[PDB]
């Protein structure tokens, strides 16, 4: 019922800390329980998140006895280790083995459909990757982009409501409950019921106006998409782009994007600096990098600030009070990185520019992209 | 300003009212005004809607003089009998013919912003379909679905505003000034705006609740992805599924789909009807179909219709008025086929069944797959 | 033994005329001995010869079960009626069951050789396409160019033993007996050992010399591909080139191929003649098509002759007995479309223009593109 | 002339050694001589030899200015620091510069003859990079695989004349003199007169027969092509298999080559050997390996070695003598490695086994895979 995810939010929420195995599927707990770490496990799929089971930090809590994939089981090639097989032995295998348990690695409608109706055609018990890592007990030996952030959002609840209050329209709350019940319960239709494409990030939230004579701060810059992005929706009329970028290659990149403007009337308005978005200026290992705050990297009010880095979001956004506290630039801040950023972030750039309107909305078909607006 | 969407409506429905060329490049309108039909024009890509231009009934309002492709200009092809030339050549041509007129054909980002850039570079006038359309005066001899609806939503101003006072939600309003919007101007950032993705069509909404227990009319059934898409959100988990589709081809497709399934628990509870859906019973050119109603081709009370037909789906809906009216499935009603559908349906809708809410959404970057959503 | 195939020839003749099953694998025969048409059969691949077998003219000779392909398995098609499954699907079936023998439709190393070892590995009786018709009896119900010619050589050993002995070169004598011993065994390794690339048709033969004031007819020009290759040997230097198709699609294609050469120096030397080659002067069915003599077509004597044709060769060549008997031009002419024509044409050829010095190349990995070079 | 190789060797291999620029087109030859090293240069296409031009060592013999690729000159990317432009780009900086010539780095038949005609049909002085090298007198300093070998041959015609008087089969001399004329003249069309796929590289040379109990050192076995073609021409039955090949990513990629092959008969006769083939046995850089001789590697008499390695063959073959010189088995030595290696390495195998008689057959549209043949 997406037209009551507050409600649902609040139940998971509930039942999850009370439960650690909350969203686990009943038919996999019990194996679990009956076989701990000799539960035998099968990895559907070699071109999904299976890396980041087999890279797990210390040993693993259960036996990984082999991958699927129809288009490679004759290659003779391993995946980290495991024999590749094919669908039909892998159905096989579990006919059986009771006992047995099938990680769904697949994060598109086409193949992970395919697999999670394969193994509920044969009863075989099955998990996400979100799933397996709540299941197992991987929490802190993956890596944190791809962790299980129940139990921190289970410990904000007050907080996470007074968010929900604070956003300016229905559809950005619904986003909200939406990524919090996805982190609660680990079923990402959470987010599909609410997704935006991807091409729609940062210039068509359906929340921002650009104007002809925008001045933005490209923080974390990389490949130039979001130059392309701001160049497109306004017919190639703006003052001023700074673009902020420490990655070396990112930067060659962007040489390259730099070119392919060359003879437009606005090449000379865009410059490209390479260090990292901090709250003071420090040469840091990145490898060494230069971190300045953007309030220094800048000579102008900007009208707009993007940002999406891999350093603290925080920090950077400290290091650009100056441009937020005194011009009130639109925003647009990607807010997926942590756990606590959703809080963390509106609460620091409210407490420097408390008249901003909030907005939010989720661009990917996966956990990526969600964003906060402000204007 | 996507936040005044319903402004931008009134203001865009006044100008083109009093102004057949609003929403016209005014380069381009200078060209055509002091040129006419000897305006000469250079079609940019050669795979979007350059064939809707070139197949145009009777004779063309311009000399079309080339069609500019960098991977093909070496074939010794033609398109639609025009040279194909490099983008080096066009805007060679270009900088020596005033006069001269660019039609972006390409409707993807990549490739529109790449022409569009190239053009205003070099200052040369250029259109998007949909405002060649418009410019050319060639509503009426192109295919419906790609023709200028701008007039029609004119004369219907009020009807719309009472159909935006009737949608339960803000985005759906939102929604709907959107895609009046492109309409009224051909500008299609308008639709980017609010567009969700193409996968998130009928069943990742937003709007609807689907139960493990959904008895679904499939009405327009084609290659069968809402099968696919009702198996995947319901977890292999419903009641009946009535699939219906006229077409020979489709068909054999869909023997194919439900082959995929055969193993399965649900197999047995999806049938397949090969006929149209429409008000009464009749056999009718479609190569002759059957034609038969909703009411009468399903056994059963449904939970859900989705509908997404190429004949009318005003008929298709009076022939399903017994399951609407006693029975108020859930609707996903397909609401892009004509200029007037989204007032036509809905007023159908209401007046057999008037406690239904109303939604909308857009989920295509193009103009295809606007949606209602009554439940 | 490559350097001895003039014995292998000899002594396959003789094992063939006594034996109508010579070639076929023993555990295949004894299958087929002892179930005749309930002979159980599973084709392995989508992409081959196995369309041969499945379109063949009357009742199927055995029972065909299923077809293999491993990135087709789940898709819910069928292949001629016949399931598609995996290759472990495949191995299963055969381990229980006699009796079932497996189709090798596979022409290339990579899935030949993979399906091959996958057969041997389990001990399961398997043919290729040519054992296929001669072990099941299908010679005259398939197309004649995937037919059994084993026959019609044991009828015409001397005559073959003739043609060896006035072959100019001692590759073309191993290239003879090595395609007359792929027809009398179904092996194919016998074409392996001689074979050329496709590339070195006609232009790399290794037994003509090309100046730089060729006249070329271009006999069966297809999509222009001879024309592009006389270009690249002679580095664009020619006097003429006649361009003989009778297909109308191809006569589109050749259309484009004249279009990348327009501005070259030589476009003005090459004619299109919308026709087939023939003894005379005729309009028949092919759509009919004008069928005209190689002598009425071109307006000059000519220095070489390229043919490939789907019609009669013999035919084409005496419409062209006035050039070939006065001028003497080199000749390269396809020698693959009937089991009679390495004999035929030659005899033809040397009858009205006995000194000529004769090489034979092969020059495709499949039964293709056997070509006769008089010079 | 491919019927008189032999002639046209001494006449290349005369010219040559009295004009250095002998091969090389006389409008870049005036070129070159008129402007020296401030001749500019265009480098037509992206994915050839052009790399070996711009990691050319020491200052360049001529200004490089851009390179010509219709699928990049819109991507902002440099190549080699040059810039990317079109064909039409091209074409024009052509027309206005004397004095500009173009390096065509395209390989293939289709790309290759695309850009030589684009060159011929404007009067543009064109290379091809054998003829580049030579031009500007940059022998030594590129890569030994793809220098000019020109010279080395003019030192040692009579010791040549010696080889192909010792040839067992006429195509054998066609081809060593197809080969020896390429490197005297730089026209790569002396290796499509006599080339046969890379499909038929050792084991459907024409040359060898091969029983069912092979006995095979795998010298050089890389990623396992030959173990795969031995099986193939086999049918699966061989004796032994001894695979060796020093680098460490190649024996990665046989552990999968093996596990391919698991549950064949056959499998417990092939052994891998990681360790490069040499005289005697020693730790060298090479990252060190282990070099062994190959009488000590092998426990068995074989019956046919294959060679392909990066170290010195003649050393690798040294350290077979005793196998070589006391079971003469069959080999298959590829002899494109360096300019002396065809009388160098048959020299040395005809000291220790005089019996052989040699063939030689070349496998590739390009310089690789000149093979030697003994039996
Ligand atoms: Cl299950
Ligand atoms: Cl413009
Ligand atoms: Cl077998
Ligand atoms: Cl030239």
């Not at 999850?16 to 194996?31: K, S, T, Y």
């Not at 075989?124 to 929490?139: D, T």
Request: proline share 5%.
């Amino acid at each position: 019922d997406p037209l009551a995810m507050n409600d649902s939010f609040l139940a998971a929420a509930d039942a999850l800390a009370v439960d650690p195995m909350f969203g686990i599927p009943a038919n996999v707990r019990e194996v679990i329980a009956r076989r701990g770490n000799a539960t035998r496990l099968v990895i559907l799929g070699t071109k999904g998140f299976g890396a980041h089971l087999m890279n797990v930090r210390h040993e693993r809590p259960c036996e990984v006895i082999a991958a699927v994939d129809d288009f490679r089981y004759h290659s003779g090639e391993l995946y980290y280790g495991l024999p590749i097989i094919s669908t039909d032995r892998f159905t096989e295998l579990a006919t059986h083995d009771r006992d047995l348990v099938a990680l769904n690695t697949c994060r598109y409608d086409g193949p992970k459909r395919f697999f999670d109706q394969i193994c509920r055609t044969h009863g075989i018990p099955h998990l996400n990757f979100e799933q397996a890592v709540r299941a197992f007990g991987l929490q802190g030996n993956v890596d944190y982009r791809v962790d299980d952030w129940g139990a921190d959002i289970v410990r904000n609840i007050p907080a996470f409501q007074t968010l929900a209050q604070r956003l300016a329209d229905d559809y950005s709350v619904q986003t909200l409950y939406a990524v919090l019940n996805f982190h609660l319960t680990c079923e990402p239709e959470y987010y599909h019921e609410v997704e935006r494409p991807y091409s729609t990030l940062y210039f068509r939230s359906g929340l921002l106006r650009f104007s002809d004579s925008e001045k933005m701060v490209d923080c974390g810059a990389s490949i130039g998409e979001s130059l392309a992005g701001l160049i497109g929706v306004t017919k190639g009329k703006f003052e001023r782009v700074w673009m902020i970028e420490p990655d070396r290659i990112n930067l060659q990149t962007l040489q390259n994007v730099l070119r392919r403007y060359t003879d437009t009337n606005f090449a000379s308005r865009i410059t490209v600096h390479g260090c990292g978005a901090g709250e003071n200026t420090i040469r840091v290992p990145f490898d060494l990098i230069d971190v300045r705050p953007i309030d220094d990297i800048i000579d102008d009010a900007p009208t707009f600030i993007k940002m999406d880095i891999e350093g603290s979001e925080l920090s950077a956004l400290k290091g650009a009070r100056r441009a937020i506290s005194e011009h009130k630039p639109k925003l647009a801040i990607s807010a997926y990185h942590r756990s606590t950023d959703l809080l963390d972030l509106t609460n620091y750039i409210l407490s420097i520019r408390p008249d901003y309107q909030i907005g939010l909305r989720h661009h990917t078909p996966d956990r990526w992209d969600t964003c906060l607006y402000f204007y």
